[PDB]
Amino acid sequence: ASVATAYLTLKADQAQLQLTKDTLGTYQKSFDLTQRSYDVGVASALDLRQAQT
Amino acid sequence: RLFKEGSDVKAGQQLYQIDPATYEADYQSAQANLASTQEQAQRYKLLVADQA
């Protein structure tokens, strides 16, 4: 039982790690777009700061 | 009437007052709108330097 549950937790953690990698890629794209909007002059610095957080 | 008749007048001398009160009213309204928007533009001019 312990070996089975440990292998299942490993597989579940690997899948959740892939999904958090996708979340990090999405947040990187969104932060780059807000950085472009702030560098152009349309968005203020506060909208950049919240995307940074 | 604000001139003596039969005399010489210079350019820009006021001749008659035509009782404004309406030009006075909408001049006061435009002055109030200017008094709001001018200090708004000044505050935004101050804030735009440090990108607030």
Curated annotation (Swiss-Prot), chain A:
Disulfide bonds: none annotated. It comes from the Bacteria. This is Outer membrane protein OprM. It is found in: Cell outer membrane. Belongs to the outer membrane factor (OMF) (TC 1.B.17) family. It comes from Pseudomonas aeruginosa (strain ATCC 15692 / DSM 22644 / CIP 104116 / JCM 14847 / LMG 12228 / 1C / PRS 101 / PAO1). The lineage of its organism: Bacteria, Pseudomonadati, Pseudomonadota, Gammaproteobacteria, Pseudomonadales. Disruption phenotype: Disruption of MexA, MexB and OprM significantly reduces active efflux of N-(3-oxododecanoyl) homoserine lactone/3-oxo-C12-HSL/PAI-1, but not N-butyryl homoserine lactone/C4-HSL/PAI-2. The gene is oprM. The outer membrane component of the MexAB-OprM efflux system that confers multidrug resistance. Functions as the major efflux pump for n-hexane and p-xylene efflux. Has been shown in one study to be involved in the active efflux of the autoinducer N-(3-oxododecanoyl) homoserine lactone, thereby playing an indirect role in quorum-sensing; but has been shown in another study not to be involved in efflux of this autoinducer. Over-expression of the pump increases antibiotic and solvent efflux capacities. Induction: By growth under severe iron limitation. Component of the MexAB-OprM multidrug efflux complex, composed of six MexA subunits forming a hexameric tube, binding to a MexB trimer, which interact with the trimeric OprM outer membrane channel protein. The OprM homotrimer forms a 135 Angstroms-long pore. It consists of a beta-barrel, which is probably inserted in the outer membrane, and an alpha-barrel formed by alpha-helices which probably spans the periplasm. In the ground state the periplasmic end is closed, while the outer membrane end opening is 6-8 Angstroms in diameter.
